[PDB]
């Protein structure tokens, strides 16, 4: 009866940029979701939070990233915006839970934290759970770029530059999306 490494995902030291969101696979353990106040965003879809302790699933996916405050609303089924379109897209029939909490004391630096970035330019929207780490120059005109940033040729990613003086809407928030996969194998993740 081993326990699920949720401390490795939530209490992790460094989170990834939303364009290169991290995915931790979880199988063969017992999870206490009831253990999971400082969490200021806890929205579950297709399942109630309590009953999760009485359920078993084939696999669990913990996707972790960091965005800005006013963008957390995009981490939900059937949403639009730069994050939901070009960075991290949840499916319309999403059965899981989105958890998010403010990390201003952890990810904001005086002078800017430019490590966290988000994809700004992309010709088409992402499919659900698609992951794009391409840093190729974006072609907005009728002429090619060939790795040369310039007129109608832009770098597709943009840094947040989190600062402690930003408003809570522009402050860094850490987001973990728990997806529950019911495959055709005996359930490995269970509750107490």
């Amino acid at each position, epitope marked *: 009866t081993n326990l699920c490494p949720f401390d490795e995902v939530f209490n992790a030291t460094r989170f990834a940029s939303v364009y290169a969101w991290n995915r931790k696979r979880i199988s063969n353990c017992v999870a206490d979701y009831s253990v999971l106040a400082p969490f200021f965003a806890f929205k579950c879809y297709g399942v109630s939070p309590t009953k999760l302790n009485d359920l078993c699933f084939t696999n669990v996916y913990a996707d972790s990233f960091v965005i800005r405050g006013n963008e957390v609303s995009q981490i939900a089924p059937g949403q639009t*915006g730069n994050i939901a*379109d070009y960075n991290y897209k949840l499916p319309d029939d999403f059965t899981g839970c989105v958890i998010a909490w403010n990390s201003n004391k952890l990810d904001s630096k005086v002078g800017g934290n430019y490590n966290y970035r988000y994809r700004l330019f992309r010709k*088409s929207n992402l499919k659900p759970f698609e992951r794009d780490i391409s840093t190729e120059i*974006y072609q907005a005109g009728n002429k090619p770029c060939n790795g040369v940033a310039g007129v109608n040729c*832009y770098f597709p990613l943009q840094s947040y530059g989190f600062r402690p003086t930003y408003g809570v809407g522009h402050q860094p928030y850490r987001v973990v999306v728990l997806s529950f996969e019911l495959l055709h194998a005996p359930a490995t993740v269970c509750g107490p």
Partner: antibody
Amino acid sequence: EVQLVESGGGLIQPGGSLRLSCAASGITVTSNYMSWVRQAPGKGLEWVSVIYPGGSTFYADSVKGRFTISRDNSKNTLYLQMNSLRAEDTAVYYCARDLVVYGMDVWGQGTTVTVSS
Amino acid sequence: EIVLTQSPGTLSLSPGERATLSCRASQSVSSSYLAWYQQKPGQAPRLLIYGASSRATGIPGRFSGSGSGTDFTLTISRLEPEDFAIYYCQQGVTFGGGTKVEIKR
């Protein structure tokens, strides 16, 4: 040559419809944030609508349910369809390419829309 | 939403003087998204400054943007007769009220 040529504006009665067109040159409408921004007579600039490169559309509160932004890649033209036109919609409407981080650099010449009975 | 307020409403100066236009935001906004545009009567807006401080292509060195947080400023060092127009600051969807620079007499 990178520019935007607008057309389609004129006189409309309140409650009527009108479709403004913005033919692009040098830039691809479908791979860019494209914005419609209006300016009322003697007033300032007001953002009207935007369409993302991926197709997501967003509208100002004063035009929701009445305005629809769209585009055509075969003709490389942005479009703004206005229905249920009101007296407050009389303005010069511009189309512009929004680079978000690099400002709205390419603008049109604007087209006038007058709505009165 | 964020509210950008420009000051002063009207700037009365003479050609050759220094113009300083302020744009104050209701909340602290990343300086990467703020732009300064110029508009003359009967013309379309013209992008002057992008990313708070970066000049667009074809803008004289007398125009320069600076500031951050909730206070940004566009300064025209050597005012020329063609520079007397209205100026808007814009952050994403929001636009500032505008500032008219007029001939001082």
